[PDB]
Design a protein around this ligand. Structure first.
Ligand SMILES: [Mg+2]
Lengths: 834, 50, 56, 199, 873
């Protein structure tokens, strides 16, 4: 039930730091703000780790073997992670700003560029158990006079090249006895040295500067010494080199410029293979696959992540995410895809498994406030502050209809009829709920009666009534359908901020500004429960506040809520650092989730460090933009009074942790919450828990197996559920012969029917036994079809899961089979000659 | 743009106006973003439109 | 920190400017503070004008 | 060397090119191009491969022998012999040098009669079809499959990577048989894309 | 004795065990090396932050510690180890069974004194070598020469002389020549300490009867005699800040200071350390500063500072008294109860028999703090009844903590020994609360519990009554009276609905907390000693008197599992956070892990000291246990969180003497195909089929909108010219005749060879295998490259191969998809030559198979018809 865990972060593909491909090249590791996300391009799956830094990530690296991941934040704090097990081995502090961390290709040593020192450490062994001090230092090198920009390992794990802001590139030897081999310093660059590299033979060293000069260093006579034999120049008019990488095997040099264009060159010939432009923002990080075929680029400003297959001039991956912009989210009815509305005005559809944007729509001029699907799922609606309501048809990606009010009113909330024929929107400026007809587009009527702005709307899926709530401290139930129109107002203690309708359509829950979730019965218009939330909410002091968090009244209410499709649970979130999941019937908090643990965000901490406070003020509030070397960093474009609706640069204040909207998954036991960092998806998929149901001494994982060996399938299957072990249920599920399925299916007790249907839904989507599952689904529905119909909402999520399997994979297979059959008949039956 | 950000985007919508767009028949996959997946396959013009 | 220091021409007064924006003007021999600004900005350098009365 | 330093098959197919010796006969039409380009043909054989080279005016052949005291790479003789043959077959000198430089380049040779027995104007018709107007068709095949082709009357020689010459040869054969030009062009577009792709 | 699930991590809560610490200076800064049993810790003198710990636990307890710059020498039994940064670099093994007692290092010489009055001298192999390793010689002091050795010391400006101090008298040994240079006069009192003075040739000697002697070695004569009647000296140290002060530590727990110049006492610090644990075991002035670091056996380390004199002139006479500066500490006696404060491995509460309750930080020792006991003033206004002399609260027997309401009001309840009420504490403020809960039946508190919401507190009395209070206001709300004997456990489920209790009478009561009704009662055979309730799974285990752990399901009120095997009482036990394991400890000196699904012991340990408490972290990553001996907490890492653990039951007989694999690892792998008749898809991503059918269209999207400019002068064969690996179909090499369109022999492609071999052998299984392995781009290339010219051999062979594939009923979507591509690329050739027999028969054989795979459509259509109907109407 209430055992949820963070699974993946959608809405963000790159924030800052360096991107790294996996050694096999089939996985891309992208730092997304405070966490590390892994995308499996080949298998179309993605996950984001649970471990969480206290600040944004600055650098990462995965060793060649693929077992250990090291990530370093902007303060130098480092977390070592066992990649296969997805667990944290050890937290390490390097007490400096670490710029780059790179594993040696052998894997034994990893080097760190911290300030002006190059630190070489010994890797902890993954097989060994955890220890107090796993890292063992090897050596610290201090030759540079200023900070190190980047470092490169030699292919034989014996030399390291470090490029610093001293206009110098310097070479070390990891072995003391070999110091005489390489103790040289390379000079002659006009600007910072961005990168230095070896050739495949290690006889040529290339150094690249920010101004755009590439030097080829060779060991030659003028008695022998390193010299610049040849010199090359990127004649970029004003762009400065921002990131450089080199692939020795293919002699490829990928350079990303601050103007947003990147160039690919061949060394030592310096023939320009290509150059493309990904935008007007700098190319922050570039990486190369091991084979050298895929180049991954990243732009921090707009959060673009691009993987380029330069061989075929193709895009494997091309995505753009959102930061501090996701204002809403809406699940597809099957739950396969999630929609988001951003302040930019762009509606983006993300696929849950892959984590990538399937489609983007940019019709809306201003911020989109809310999004909702039709009950059918083929159509989508969205409301924006530009003054319009727009209907989207997904099958053809067309704005097939657009509605607009007469009086030029901003829209903030939206609700669509179950029949997909009426659309109503509310405003913060009009006090009236406009209603339109989907088929014709005309304004049917303007519902009036509120003395305050309408904060939220929702249709009953069954009864088709409309429930509206406002800051007027009231809730009104409109029977708009029917010959006669009726309005039934219900009073509340305080302003209403959010509203959710039970799938039954018999009750409505409303969150008030007092921090109260009140559940009312629609037909009786009387209260049936109340839940306190003010104590549960976790709110943090901002760096700018002059008052404590406890006395702070900034956000102690829930601005969004939603029922579980079963109808027994409510998930709530607000302008705060908590997502609270309440159980409706007993009015208790099942669990509380911390949205973020990043101190870069403003609202994360309840108690701030006293050291930061001074006579001058909080050290965080001092603006240090002047120190930044590049002009584009120093320039301040912030408007004095802005709070929302523009770029981060406009704010001048740190982003604030908040959950714009939350929703449950129609198909799986999971929920998605849009926040500043992105869409946090919490799921119970791992299900490591042991939650036996009606267990007894006679039931045992050992005992179940004989029931199979003795061919007592029903007793084996029922005993498998009582333990509720997935691996055991799977074992019994596949060992039952097809002949006995119709016999067993009829005899399953009614209590365990919801569980098996959930299992088949979760198992069938990714399992390879399409027909065997379909035999099972046919058996169960025929045997217990009547029971399922009587209890719709107990089986709602399970039933949707089965349909998603039957439509999304099963239908696609036969759709080709029927295709080949007809293409077959035409070729043979037809006459072809001449 | 500057005024809207200054007012925290509590502005008033602009006059509605009618404009003409040209829709070119293309496979629906082309309209999508670039990754190893597509979510629809139909054409971008309905049969009536053809 | 870090702090940039500039003495007056006659050596009677001292001007220190922190990088984080702490500017102080004082008479260092007699331990008298003339002015102390806590500008929340990035100060780079400061100098005394014709006399200790004005500084930039 | 920098202080950081680390610590007989024939490429041509369809013709028998083979202290060891190799002899390659030069046809009359390649005599003059061989002459003015010999200032750039003998160096790479004698310095890189460490071979001994001559032109036999009496027999009009290029004679190549291994020096036991100087030559070191056992495959140098065959490598050098193939390089001369590519120049003999009509490929430009820089293309021929690629065989010395690269170790994964193969020459496929075949005649129109091998694919199908064509004679008279029909044989002329096929050579016209392979060539295309102003050489467009062969140029398309060359660029799409990343191959160099020399269409010497009824004899075709294709230089490039293994699978590349396999695809260039297939397109040429399809042209000889009489497949519709559009189908051949349609493939020539997509063969290029598939070859360069990683997956 | 080695667990397969757990492994030691470190010990929390120890700063010093009583062995004299050693001070070491790196540059200007100083560090302190303290002994903790079998390992040592290095603290920074400035902040008393932990820096390093010994990598491995020494086999035997450490006896002496000496530190010189980076290197630290630790002596245990007959071996002296050399450590750098907490990692051993070299081990010195003495040749005599006698255990080392004292240790001195000067220059290249390392001197070790054994208990048999034998001094071993080691020397550096090289003058520039960092530490001595080589064995130089052996010097033995006989009883005629002197008594037992008290300590070894080396005065400054002495070439190769070691000042051996014995109880009887002092001796001077020349290590280089190994000859006794000088012998002191016999002293009347037994010497107990020796400290070189900052002056030349003078070493301070402390006797057992409170005499401090400023013995001058060069003159061999006494210089001064301080007298401390009725005291025993334990440490001596000199102030090097330019003031002639001497700090004289005593075993009674006092530290006296003398000003040698003025022959007067500056001050006395009384009871800085407990006398029961050895008093001031060591007190050392930091070199050249007024800070003195003091330690003792009570598990504490303190620092005191001399402030500057408050008089402008005559600063020498007006000396400010020493002032407490900073310290670190722990329990003086083993902890009695423990609990994890927060969901993370964040903080850990510990209460000990020394009547002090501590909050220990797992992640930084500096964060550890003692929960103060200062009381609030009563709300009523009446005076609080208590002895004027302040005394710590009695020992904490039971503890319960919740965090649903941390920072709003009290969130901890504690029960005290022989006390008729339970006190409250607040974790956020780190101080005792303002509420006291009384049993109201004249009975001692035996059990305390908290509701998850953090509103209620349950107190279980020894007389059988359960009283329920409200934490916010400390007002009694309800009292339940079922048990007649002592209640030994109380718990409430997460939903705050069903409450369960247990008592010595052996009955387990089931209550409905909302309605205040008795749902049911269960009688067990034996008295119940303890209870652990798992809220996520609604299972609670009961430690019965008959050496069993009985697991019960609160929902149905029946015994679900019973665990046997402990040979004595079960001290404590806990549930794993995932609800799958129970770890229990017993007086027979073992810890056993029980796998609840199978109900058997999977791991067993034999602990030298009985484990009095066992507690899992809520994460499950760490297991913490406390023992009857040792002032600290033993922390164990859970190996199960990084790899699977076999659930095979442990061997009982072997465990006593010391004092299906898929099922064993709780995993299962789905079959490749249940039945040959059942259709089965491919073992791979499901986007493979969609990608194959629409390869070209997806690529068109992938292309950039604007063409990329390229250099006019580029190598034609750049792609081939890659120094060396790419495995693409582009990178294929031939494997070793008339020209053939499909492929010349020796030049053929691997795919064609497998096809042609398949045609002759009449089995394409090898070809189907490689086709599935092919990437989508490769598959399109091969299908199109098939020969389409008469007699159409390759096309016909390909159809038979795919016809063979469908018969298997495996990977049928990919075999199907290949035929969609075959028609797309070669549809016209098939159409034009449909009358050809080889194509017609090959196609006809295919149709007969493909017609059989039509049952799938019937199932798919049926399920949609009902699934839409059932879910709708
Ligand atoms: Mg009426």
């Amino acid at each position: 039930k209430s055992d949820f865990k963070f699974s993946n972060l959608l809405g963000t593909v790159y924030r800052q730091g360096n991107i790294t491909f996996s050694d096999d090249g089939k996985q891309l590791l992208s730092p997304v703000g405070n966490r590390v996300s892994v995308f499996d391009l080949i298998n179309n799956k993605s996950f984001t780790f649970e471990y969480e830094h206290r600040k944004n990530i600055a650098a990462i690296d995965l060793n060649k073997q693929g077992t250990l991941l090291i990530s370093i934040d902007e303060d130098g704090r480092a977390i070592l992670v066992n990649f296969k097990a997805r667990n944290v081995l050890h937290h390490f502090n390097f007490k400096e700003k670490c710029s780059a961390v790179k594993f040696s290709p052998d894997g034994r040593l990893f080097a760190l560029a911290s300030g002006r020192f190059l630190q070489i450490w010994k890797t902890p062994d993954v097989n060994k158990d955890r220890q107090f001090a796993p890292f063992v230092r090897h050596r610290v090198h201090a030759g540079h006079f200023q900070d190190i920009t980047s470092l490169t390992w030699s292919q034989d794990s014996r030399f390291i090249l470090t490029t610093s802001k001293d206009l110098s590139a310097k070479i070390w030897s990891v072995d003391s006895e070999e110091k005489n081999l390489a103790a040289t310093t390379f000079n002659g660059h006009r600007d910072y040295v961005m990168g230095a590299f070896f050739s495949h033979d290690q006889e040529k060293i290339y150094t690249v500067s920010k101004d755009g000069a590439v030097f080829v260093w060779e060991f030659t006579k003028r008695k022998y010494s390193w010299r610049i034999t040849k010199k090359h120049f990127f004649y970029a008019n004003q762009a400065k080199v921002k990131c450089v990488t080199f692939h020795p095997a293919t002699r490829l040099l990928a350079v990303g410029f601050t103007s947003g264009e990147f160039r690919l060159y061949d060394l030592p010939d310096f023939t320009l293979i290509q150059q493309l432009s990904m935008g007007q923002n700098p190319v922050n990080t570039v990486s190369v696959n091991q084979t050298g075929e895929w180049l991954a680029f990243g732009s921090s400003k707009l959060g673009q992540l691009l993987v380029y297959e330069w061989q075929s001039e193709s895009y494997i991956l091309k995505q753009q995410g959102h930061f501090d912009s996701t204002n809403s989210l809406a699940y597809s009815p099957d739950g396969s895809r999630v929609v988001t509305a951003s302040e930019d005005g762009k509606i983006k559809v993300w696929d849950i498994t892959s984590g990538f944007c399937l489609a983007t729509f940019e019709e809306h001029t201003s911020s989109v406030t809310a999004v909702q699907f039709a009950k059918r799922g083929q159509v989508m609606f969205s409301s924006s502050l530009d003054g319009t309501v727009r209907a989207w048809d997904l099958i053809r990606y067309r704005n097939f209809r657009t509605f607009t009010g007469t009086e030029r009113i901003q829209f903030n909330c939206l609700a669509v009829d179950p029949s997909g024929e009426v659309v109503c929107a509310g405003s913060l400026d009009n006090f009236d709920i406009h209603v339109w007809s989907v088929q014709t587009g005309q304004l049917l009527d303007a519902l009036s009666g509120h003395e305050g702005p309408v904060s939220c709307l929702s249709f009953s899926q069954e009864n088709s009534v409309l429930a509206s709530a406002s800051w007027d401290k009231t809730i009104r139930i409109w029977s708009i359908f029917g010959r006669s129109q009726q309005v039934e107002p219900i009073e509340v203690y305080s302003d209403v901020l959010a509203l959710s309708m039970r799938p039954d359509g018999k009750e409505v829950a409303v969150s008030t500004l007092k921090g109260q979730i009140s559940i009312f019965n629609i037909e009786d218009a009387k209260q049936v429960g109340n839940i306190d939330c003010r104590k549960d909410i976790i709110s943090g002091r901002f760096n700018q506040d002059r008052f404590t968090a406890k006395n702070s009244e900034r956000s102690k209410f829930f601005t969004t809520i939603h029922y579980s499709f079963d109808g027994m649970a409510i998930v709530a979130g607000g302008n705060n650092n908590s997502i609270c999941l309440y159980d409706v019937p007993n009015e208790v908090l099942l669990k509380r989730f911390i949205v973020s643990r990043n101190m870069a965000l403003n609202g994360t901490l309840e108690f701030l460090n006293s050291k930061k406070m001074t006579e001058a003020g909080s050290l965080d509030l001092i603006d240090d933009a002047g120190e930044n070397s590049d002009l584009e960093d120093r320039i301040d474009n912030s408007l004095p009074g802005s709070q929302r609706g523009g770029d981060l640069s406009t704010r001048k204040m740190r982003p604030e942790v908040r959950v714009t909207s939350v929703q449950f998954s129609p198909t799986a036991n999971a929920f998605a919450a849009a926040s500043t960092e992105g869409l946090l998806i919490y799921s119970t998929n791992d299900t490591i828990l042991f939650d036996p149901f009606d267990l007894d001494v006679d039931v045992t994982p050992h005992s179940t197996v004989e029931a199979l060996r003795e061919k007592q399938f029903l007793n084996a299957l029922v005993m498998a559920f009582r333990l509720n072990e997935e691996y055991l249920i799977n074992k019994v599920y596949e060992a039952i012969p097809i002949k006995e399925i119709p016999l067993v299916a009829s005899n399953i007790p009614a209590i365990y029917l919801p569980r098996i249907l959930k299992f088949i839904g979760d198992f069938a989507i990714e399992s390879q036994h399409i027909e065997f599952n379909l035999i099972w689904i046919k058996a169960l529905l025929s045997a217990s079809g009547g029971y399922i119909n009587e209890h719709k909402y107990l089986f709602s999520t399970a039933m949707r899961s089965i349909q998603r399997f039957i439509v999304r994979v099963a239908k696609e297979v036969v759709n080709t089979t029927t295709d080949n059959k007809y293409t077959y008949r035409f070729l043979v039956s037809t006459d072809g000659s001449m | 743009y500057k005024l809207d950000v200054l007012s925290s985007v509590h502005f008033v919508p602009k006059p509605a106006s009618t404009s003409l767009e040209i829709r070119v028949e293309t496979p629906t996959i082309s309209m999508e973003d670039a990754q190893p997946l597509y979510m629809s396959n139909a054409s971008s013009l309905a049969p009536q439109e053809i | 920190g870090p702090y940039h220091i500039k003495y007056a021409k006659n050596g009677t007064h001292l001007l220190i400017t922190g990088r984080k924006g702490h500017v102080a003007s004082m008479d260092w021999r007699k331990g008298q503070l003339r002015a102390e600004l806590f500008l929340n900005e990035t100060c780079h350098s400061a100098t005394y004008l014709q006399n200790e009365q004005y500084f930039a | 060397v920098a202080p950081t330093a680390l610590k007989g098959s024939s490429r041509i197919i369809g013709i028998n090119n083979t202290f060891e010796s190799r002899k390659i006969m030069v046809p009359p039409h390649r005599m003059t191009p061989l002459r003015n380009s010999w200032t750039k043909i003998y160096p790479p054989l004698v310095e890189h491969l460490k071979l001994q080279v001559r032109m036999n005016l009496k027999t009009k052949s290029v004679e190549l022998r291994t020096n036991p005291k100087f030559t070191t790479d056992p495959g140098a003789l065959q490598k050098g012999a193939d390089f001369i043959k590519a120049f003999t077959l009509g490929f430009d000198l820089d293309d021929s040098i690629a065989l010395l430089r690269l170790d994964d380049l193969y020459i496929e040779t075949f005649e129109v009669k091998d694919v199908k027995t064509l004679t008279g104007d029909h044989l002329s018709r096929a050579i016209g079809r392979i060539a295309g107007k102003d050489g467009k068709t062969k140029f398309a095949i060359e660029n799409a499959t990343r191959t160099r082709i020399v269409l010497a009357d009824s004899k075709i020689h294709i230089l490039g990577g293994f699978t590349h010459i396999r695809m260039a040869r297939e397109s040429v054969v399809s042209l000889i048989l009489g497949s519709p030009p559009g189908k051949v062009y349609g493939n020539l577009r997509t063969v290029a894309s598939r070859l360069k792709e990683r997956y | 004795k080695n667990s397969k699930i757990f492994s030691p991590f470190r010990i929390i809560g120890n700063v010093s065990n009583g062995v004299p610490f050693a001070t070491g200076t790196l540059g200007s800064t100083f560090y302190i090396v303290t002994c903790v049993g079998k390992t040592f810790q290095i603290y920074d003198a400035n902040t008393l932050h932990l820096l390093f710990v010994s990598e491995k636990e020494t086999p035997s307890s450490i006896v002496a510690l000496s530190a010189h710059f980076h290197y630290v020498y630790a002596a245990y039994e007959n071996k002296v180890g050399i450590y750098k940064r907490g990692i051993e670099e070299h081990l010195l093994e003495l040749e005599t069974d006698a255990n080392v007692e004292h240790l001195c290092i000067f220059g290249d010489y390392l001197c070790a004194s054994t208990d048999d009055n034998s001094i071993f001298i080691y020397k550096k192999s090289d003058p520039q070598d960092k530490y001595p390793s080589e064995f130089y010689t052996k010097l033995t002091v006989t009883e005629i020469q002197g008594g037992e050795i008290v300590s070894l010391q080396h005065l400054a400006t002495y070439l190769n002389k070691l000042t051996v101090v014995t109880k009887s008298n002092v001796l001077l040994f020349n290590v280089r020549t190994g000859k006794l240079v000088f012998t002191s006069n016999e002293f009347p009192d037994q010497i107990t300490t020796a400290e070189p003075a900052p002056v030349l040739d003078i070493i301070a000697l402390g006797t057992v009867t409170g005499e401090v002697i400023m013995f001058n070695m060069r003159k061999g004569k006494r210089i001064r005699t301080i007298k401390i009647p009725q005291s025993r000296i334990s440490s001596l140290s000199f102030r090097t800040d330019g003031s002639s002060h001497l700090s004289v530590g005593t075993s009674s727990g006092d530290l006296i200071f003398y000003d040698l110049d003025r022959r007067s006492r500056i001050h006395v610090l009384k009871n800085i350390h407990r006398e029961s644990y050895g008093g001031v075991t060591q007190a050392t002035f930091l070199n050249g500063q007024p800070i003195i670091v003091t330690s003792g056996g009570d598990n504490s380390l303190k620092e005191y500072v001399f402030d500057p004199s408050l008089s402008q002139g005559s600063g020498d006479v007006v000396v400010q008294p020493p002032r407490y500066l900073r310290s670190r500490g722990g329990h003086s006696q083993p902890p009695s109860y423990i609990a994890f404060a927060d969901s993370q491995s964040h903080f850990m509460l510990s209460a000990s028999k020394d009547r002090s309750l501590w909050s220990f930080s797992l992640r930084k020792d500096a964060q550890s703090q003692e929960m103060s006991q200062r009381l609030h003033k009563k709300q009523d206004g009446g005076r609080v009844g208590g002895s004027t002399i302040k005394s710590k609260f009695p020992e904490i027997v039971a503890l319960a903590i919740e965090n649903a309401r941390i920072g709003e009001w009290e969130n901890i309840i504690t029960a005290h020994k022989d006390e008729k009420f339970a006190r409250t504490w607040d974790m956020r403020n780190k101080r005792v609360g303002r509420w006291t809960f009384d049993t109201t039946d004249d009975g001692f508190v035996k059990s305390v519990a908290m509701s998850q919401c953090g509103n209620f507190g349950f107190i279980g009395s020894s007389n059988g009554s359960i009283t329920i209070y409200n934490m916010q206001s400390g007002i009694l709300r309800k009292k339940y009276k079922l048990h007649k004997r002592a209640v030994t456990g109380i718990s409430l489920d997460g939903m705050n609905r069903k409450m369960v209790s247990c008592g010595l009478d052996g009955i387990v009561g089931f209550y409905d907390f909302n309605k205040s009704t008795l749902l049911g009662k269960l009688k067990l055979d034996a008295p119940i000693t303890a209870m652990v309730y798992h809220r996520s799974s609604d299972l609670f285990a009961l430690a019965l008197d008959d050496l069993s752990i009985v697991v019960i399901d609160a929902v149905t009120q029946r015994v679900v599992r019973q665990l046997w095997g402990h040979s004595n009482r079960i001290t404590a036990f806990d549930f794993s956070p995932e609800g799958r394991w129970i770890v229990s400890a017993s007086l027979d000196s073992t810890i056993r892990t029980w796998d609840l699904p199978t109900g058997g012991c999977i791991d067993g340990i034999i602990v030298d000291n009985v484990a009095t408490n066992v507690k899992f972290s809520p994460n499950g990553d760490l297991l913490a246990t406390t023992h009857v001996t040792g002032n600290g907490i033993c922390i164990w890492t859970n190996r199960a969180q990084f790899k699977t653990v076999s659930t095979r039951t442990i061997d009982e007989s072997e465990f006593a003497r010391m004092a299906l694999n898929d099922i064993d690892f709780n995993t299962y792998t789905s079959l490749e195909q249940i039945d040959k008749e059942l259709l089965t898809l491919s073992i791979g991503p499901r986007s493979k089929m969609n990608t194959l059918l629409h390869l070209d269209v997806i690529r068109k999207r992938s292309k950039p909108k604007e063409a990329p400019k390229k250099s006019e002068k580029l190598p034609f064969f750049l792609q081939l010219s890659g120094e060396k690996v790419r495995e693409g179909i582009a990178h294929e090499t031939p494997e070793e005749n008339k020209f053939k369109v499909t492929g010349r022999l020796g030049f053929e492609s691997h795919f064609t060879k497998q096809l042609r071999e398949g045609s002759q052998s009449k089995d394409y299984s090898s070809l189907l295998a490689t086709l599935i392995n092919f990437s989508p781009a490769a598959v399109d290339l091969e299908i199109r490259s098939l020969n389409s010219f008469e007699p159409f051999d390759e096309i016909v062979w390909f159809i038979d191969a795919l016809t063979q594939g469908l018969k298997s009923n495996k990977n049928f979507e990919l075999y199907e998809t290949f035929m969609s591509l075959l028609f797309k690329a070669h549809g016209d050739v098939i159409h034009a030559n449909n009358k050809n027999q080889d194509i017609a028969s090959a196609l006809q054989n295919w149709e007969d198979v493909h017609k059989k795979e039509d049952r799938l459509d019937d199932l798919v259509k049926f399920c949609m018809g009902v699934a839409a109907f059932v879910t709708t109407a």
